[PDB]
Amino acid sequence: PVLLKSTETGQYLRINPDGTVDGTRDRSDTHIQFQISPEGNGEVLLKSTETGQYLRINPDGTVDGTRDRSDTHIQFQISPEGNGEVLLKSTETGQYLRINPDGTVDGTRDRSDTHIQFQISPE
Ligand SMILES: [Cl-]
Structure with a gap:
């Protein structure tokens, strides 16, 4: 598993069992663990290790978790940003x-936006 941490605020991404997505600095929360898996030849899915939910950015800008593998808004591209930092971009909406x-x-x-920079780290 990896962790996805906001560089600016030091918060880790978390997908809760209720489907909501938020940030936490609680390193002990099992819900901040992710698996990055291939989707086709150039994209990834970001899946919660503990809940099996995929991160989704909806057209309206909301972010939640879903287990609907057919959803077109769970596909991401990870782009290097200099240093150990990356951006996590929705392929479908460009967000x-x-x-x-x-x-x-x-x-x-x-x-x-300074709050879109992430560092990916092995747990
Ligand atoms: Cl705020």
């Missing part, structure tokens, strides 16, 4: 995953 300082998680098309 970047963002963790806000209040712990909410959402999507934005603004590539200059």
Whole structure:
């Protein structure tokens, strides 16, 4: 498993069993563990290790978890950002995953937003 941490706020992405997605600094939470798996030849899915849910950025910018493997909004591209940092971009909507300082998680098309930078680390 890997962890997905917001560089700016030091919060880890978490998919809760209720399907909501938020950020936490609780390193002991089992729900911050992810598996990155291939989808076709150029994309990835980001799946919760403990709940089996996939991260989804909806067209309206909300971010939640789903187990619907047919959903077209669970596909991501990971793009290097210099240093050990990456952006996590929805292929379908062109939105970047963002963790806000209040712990909410959402999507934005603004590539200059400081809250879209992530560091991926083995657990
Ligand atoms: Cl905020």
